[PDB]
């Protein structure tokens, strides 16, 4: 599903090539939800610095995973103005990776703390988007879902599709049933296995 559907415009990946992800099972995978403008797609990608890269989310320069974005001028774009989306552009320090800040404080520009209502030298860090379809390329919403790959000290449970071939009878083949390799022919048997075991 990730490879096809050519409206998914972003296809370059940093850590591992996407066509080789069928093997090498990991512990668990993650999914996110990023709604950004056209210029902010490249800033999310590692190795680039932008207004969304240092004040909203700092992705590591090398990590196992990547992003895929698609044009959403017909889904996330409304003619009445899409005002729900918010982002932080006022951060005092730098950003560590892999955390969220849901602070609802005020940002000051002077040395003294401003506080209270907004105005001059006292700004809210959360600023609202607007995603009407009449705008050009660079402001259209591109939904970004980043995937996480990790190899923590647990047995792997997230995998890909498994390759199953046809059944060949009375012929000398090389069976690989559930990872058990061997050589011989396969015949119908009268044996009565219990359902609690797979090998004889």
């Amino acid at each position, epitope marked *: 599903v990730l490879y096809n559907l050519a409206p998914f415009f972003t296809f370059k990946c940093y850590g591992v090539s996407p066509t080789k992800l069928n093997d090498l099972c990991f512990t668990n995978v993650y999914a996110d939800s990023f709604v950004i403008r056209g210029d902010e797609v490249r800033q999310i990608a590692p190795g680039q610095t932008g207004n969304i890269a240092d004040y909203n989310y700092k992705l590591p320069d090398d990590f196992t995973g990547c992003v895929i974005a698609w044009n959403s001028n017909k889904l996330d774009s409304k003619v009445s103005g899409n005002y729900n989306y918010l982002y932080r*552009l006022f951060r005092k320090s730098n950003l560590k990776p892999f955390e969220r800040d849901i602070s609802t404080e005020i940002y000051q520009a*002077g040395n003294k703390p401003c506080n209270g209502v907004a105005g*001059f030298n006292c700004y809210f860090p959360l600023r609202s988007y*607007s995603f009407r379809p009449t705008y050009g390329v660079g402001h259209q919403p591109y939904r970004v879902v980043v995937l996480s790959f990790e190899l923590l000290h647990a047995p792997a449970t997230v995998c890909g599709p498994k390759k199953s071939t046809n059944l060949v009878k009375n012929k000398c083949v090389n069976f690989n049933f559930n990872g058990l390799k061997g050589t011989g022919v396969l015949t119908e048997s009268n044996k009565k296995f219990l359902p609690f075991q797979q090998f004889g």
Partner: antibody, heavy 120, light 104 residues
Framework: VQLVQSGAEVKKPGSSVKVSCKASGGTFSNYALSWVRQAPGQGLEWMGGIIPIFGTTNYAQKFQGRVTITADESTSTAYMELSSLRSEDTAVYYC????????????????????WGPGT | DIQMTQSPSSLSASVGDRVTITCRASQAIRNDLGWYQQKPGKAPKCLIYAASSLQSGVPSRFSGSGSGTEFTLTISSLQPEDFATYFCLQQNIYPRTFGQGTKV
């Protein structure tokens, strides 16, 4: 949106000069109308930014109280009064829609400045 | 307010040269820097809203670079139609600094 400045006044000192910028189109607020002095012989400096809905009076150095910038209820025209006319303060006043926080429709932080006074 | 400097006014070059119009700063800010233009006797305009952001309504000759204490404007192909005076915007109070761009 387009900003149109009013005419000049008498050059002689002992009086207060009054200027006004009319913002035709785009009845919007919380974008501070920044006033700046332009001259071929001197540099530019911030004189002040007026907000219609808030009306804060944050100013720069060396002219605190010599200048008063006010406006109407929403957008419209912005008035600026300067007292104690002198010889080194002569320039042209430019009002600009500077980017910043908006508490109105909440659509663009960077709307795009395309408005300038004719120059009086 | 705290003072800062800008590029000298003696930047003369022919058609198709790179200019190094430098704005020196004192505080670590990114979006608050800007480059504006003022033609002598004509209508003013902007050049860049920040180092990493441009404007709609400019040719691609005007470019910005740098993110430290200096910010550099560069023209890819210099033309006589770019005869204007360029000024730099910093900080919250906006102390602006002198500037003069003429090719001679």
């Amino acid at each position: 949106v387009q900003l149109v400045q009013s005419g000049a006044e008498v050059k002689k000192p002992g009086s207060s000069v009054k200027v006004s910028c009319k913002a035709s189109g785009g009845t919007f607020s919380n974008y501070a109308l920044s006033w700046v002095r332009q001259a071929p012989g001197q540099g530019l400096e911030w004189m002040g930014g007026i907000i219609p809905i808030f009306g804060t009076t944050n100013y720069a150095q060396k002219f605190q109280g010599r200048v008063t910038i006010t406006a109407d209820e929403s957008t419209s025209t912005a008035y600026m009064e300067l007292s104690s006319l002198r010889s080194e303060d002569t320039a042209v006043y430019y009002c600009a829609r500077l980017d910043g926080y908006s508490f109105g429709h909440d659509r663009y932080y960077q709307d795009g400045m395309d408005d300038w006074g004719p120059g009086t | 307010d705290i003072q800062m400097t800008q590029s000298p006014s003696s930047l003369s070059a022919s058609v198709g040269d790179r200019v190094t119009i430098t704005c020196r700063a004192s505080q670590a800010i990114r979006n608050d820097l800007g480059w504006y233009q003022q033609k002598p006797g004509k209508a003013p305009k902007c050049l860049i809203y920040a180092a990493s952001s441009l404007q709609s309504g400019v040719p691609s000759r005007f470019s910005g670079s740098g993110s430290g204490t200096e910010f550099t404007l560069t023209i890819s192909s210099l033309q006589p139609e770019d005869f204007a005076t360029y000024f730099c915007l910093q900080q919250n109070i906006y102390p602006r600094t002198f500037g003069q761009g003429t090719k001679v």
